[PDB]
Structure 1
Amino acid sequence: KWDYDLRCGEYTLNLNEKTLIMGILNVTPDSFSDGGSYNEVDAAVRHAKEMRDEGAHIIDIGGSVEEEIKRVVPMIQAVSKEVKLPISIDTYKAEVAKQAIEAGAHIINDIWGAKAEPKIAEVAAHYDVPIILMHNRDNMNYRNLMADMIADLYDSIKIAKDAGVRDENIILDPGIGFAKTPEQNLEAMRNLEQLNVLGYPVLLGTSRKSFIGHVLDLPVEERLEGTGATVCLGIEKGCEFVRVHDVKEMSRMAKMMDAMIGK
C-alpha cells in the first residue's frame, strides 16, 4: 500500500509493516532556568529512553520565540544524542523549526498545518524533512465537518507543495480536539477513513484528550481505556501513526490491532 518509506535523515520509517507510535515528551520547565538545566534535560532524556524501551518509534518534543528555542533546543540535542529514534519538533513557528532541525530534529509537527507561519513549509522543503499538517482553524462554523476538514487540510497541502514540499514528506492529521465540539470530535473519529482519499499518511492524536473525558466522565489521568478505544478505531480506519502519552499500553494495543487488520 505505501510504495515509499518515510525518510528521516539517519532513520527510515516503514509505513506498511506496523502502526508507528509517536511518544509525547514530558517538558516540565526548570523555574530559574532559561532552558538547558540538568534537571529538565535529564528528566527529558530519561523519559525518552523509557518511551524508546516501551515501543515508541518517534519522540515528539514541544516548547516567546527566542525563549521557546532556548527551552527546546537543549532537549533535542540531548535526546537525539542519547536516544536513537527520530525526533519531531512540535512547533508552528518557522524560526523554531529551523533551529530544531539544526539542533537535531527529523520531522516537523505543526498544529496549524503551515497556516500560522507559512514560512515553516519553506523550512520544511529546504531541510527535506517530513511535515505533519494538522487540521486546525480559528472558529467552528462547519457547513459539513468532514468535507470542511478535508478542504482545510487540502489548503495546507497547497501551502506545503507551493513552498516546495515533496508529497512524500506530507503527513496529515484530523486535529482531534481542535476547533471541534465534543460531538464533532466523535464524528471526525467516526469518519476518519475519509482522510485517506487525500492520498497521504495520517497521524492520529487523541491521547488523554477532553472528548474522552466528556464521554467517560473521567479526569485526565483516568483516560487510558478511552485513549485505547480511539487508537484502535484510528488504526482500523487506516492511520499510519498515533501520538500517545501511554506508550507501553498503546503500543501493545496498536500491535494487536495490526495483527488483526493484517497490516
Structure 2
Amino acid sequence: KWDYDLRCGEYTLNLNEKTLIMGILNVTPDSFSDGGSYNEVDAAVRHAKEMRDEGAHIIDIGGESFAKVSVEEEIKRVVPMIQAVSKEVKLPISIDTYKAEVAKQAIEAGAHIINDIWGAKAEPKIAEVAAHYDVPIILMHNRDNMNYRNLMADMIADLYDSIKIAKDAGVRDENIILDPGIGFAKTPEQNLEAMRNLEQLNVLGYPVLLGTSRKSFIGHVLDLPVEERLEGTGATVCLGIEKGCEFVRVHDVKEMSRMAKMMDAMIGK
C-alpha cells in the first residue's frame, strides 16, 4: 500500500508491516514547579518505559491538557520530558502542540513528529517548522464550530485545507499524516458517523492516525465512565484498522497492541 517508510531521523517506521501504536504519555505536572522536576519527569519516563515494554511504537508528549500555562511555561514543561524520554526510551516521540514555537523547541529537544490538533490552522507557521526540520506532521481535523452541511464531505475539504497549508510551506507528501479528529467539533452522533465512514479519508492518499481512546462518545454509547471504556475503545480501534488506518493513538497500550496485532493478522496486513 505504501511505497515509502516514515523517516523519523534515527528511527524509521514501516507503514505496511503492522498497525502502529502511539502511546499517550501521562504528563502530570508537579504543583510547585514549572520545571523538569524529578517527580514529574521520573513519572513520565517510567510511563514511557512501560508503554514501550507493552508494544508502543511512538510516544506522544504534550505540555497542556493542571495549572494554566503560557507558551514559555508550556515549553519549560515539555522540553525536559522530551529530553529524558528521548535519552532513556528508544522510540520516536511526537510533540502534541498546535503552536509553532513549542514545536520548534520540542524538535530541538529531541522530538521526531509534530502532532497538531488544529491541523496547522491555529498557527500556520507550524508547517514552516515542520518543513524546515523535515519531520512528519499529523494534521488533525478540527473546527471552532459544528456547522456541517455534510459531515464527511466537509471533513475531507477541511483536511485538504490543512494539506494545502503544509504543502505551501514546503512539507513533503511523505511527511503528512491525517487524522479525522474523533471527539473534536463533532456531536456524539457525528463521531459515530465518522467512524462508520472513515475509509473515505483514504482517497486523499496519506496515512491516517485514529484517536478514539476513552473518549466521551464511547461513554455516550455504553453509559460508562472513563475508566470503564477499554472494550469500547477496543471496538473503535478494530473498526479503524479494518477501515485502513496506519496508526492508533491510545492510553491502554498492552490491550490495544494485542487487539491491533490480531486485527492485522486477520486483514492480512
The one-character-per-residue Cα deviations of 1:5-34 (angstroms, maximum 9, x if unpaired) are: 000000000000000000000011001100
The residue number in structure 2 matching 1:253 is 259
The one-character-per-residue Cα deviations of 1:163-193 (angstroms, maximum 9, x if unpaired) are: 0000000000000000000000000000000
The one-character-per-residue Cα deviations of 1:86-143 (angstroms, maximum 9, x if unpaired) are: 0000000000000000000000000000000000000000000000000000000001
| Structure 2 residue matching 1:152: 3-state secondary structure | helix
The residue number in structure 2 matching 1:179 is 185
Q: How far off is 1:35 after superposition?
A: 2.0
Q: How far off is 1:61 after superposition?
A: 0.2
| 101, 108, 111: which one aligns with 2:107 | 101
| Structure 2 residue matching 1:185: 3-state secondary structure | helix
The residue number in structure 2 matching 1:31 is 31
Identity %: 100
Q: Which runs of 5+ in 2 are unaligned?
A: 64-69
Q: How far off is 1:214 after superposition?
A: 0.3
* C-alpha distance in 2 between matches for 1:167 and 1:35: 36
Report the TM-score, using the length of structure 2 for normalisation: 0.98
Q: How far off is 1:240 after superposition?
A: 0.1
* C-alpha distance in 2 between matches for 1:66 and 1:56: 30
What's the RMSD between the two structures over aligned residues?
0.3
| Structure 2 residue matching 1:172: 3-state secondary structure | strand
* C-alpha distance in 2 between matches for 1:34 and 1:40: 10
The residue number in structure 1 matching 2:67 is none
The one-character-per-residue Cα deviations of 1:20-71 (angstroms, maximum 9, x if unpaired) are: 0000000110011002100000000000000000000000000010000000
Matched residues, number: 263
| 1:89-238 matched pairs, under 5 angstroms | 89-238=95-244
Q: How far off is 1:227 after superposition?
A: 0.1
Report the TM-score, using the length of structure 1 for normalisation: 1.00
* C-alpha distance in 1 between matches for 2:218 and 2:71: 32
| Structure 1 residue matching 2:249: 3-state secondary structure | strand
* C-alpha distance in 2 between matches for 1:117 and 1:47: 30
| Structure 2 residue matching 1:95: 3-state secondary structure | helix
Q: How far off is 1:4 after superposition?
A: 0.2
* C-alpha distance in 2 between matches for 1:25 and 1:57: 12
* C-alpha distance in 1 between matches for 2:37 and 2:73: 14
| Structure 2 residue matching 1:18: 3-state secondary structure | coil
* C-alpha distance in 1 between matches for 2:122 and 2:57: 27
| 71, 74, 78: which one aligns with 1:72 | 78
The residue number in structure 2 matching 1:48 is 48
The one-character-per-residue Cα deviations of 1:179-234 (angstroms, maximum 9, x if unpaired) are: 00000000000000000000000000000000000000000000000000000000
* C-alpha distance in 2 between matches for 1:123 and 1:35: 25
| Structure 2 residue matching 1:141: 3-state secondary structure | coil
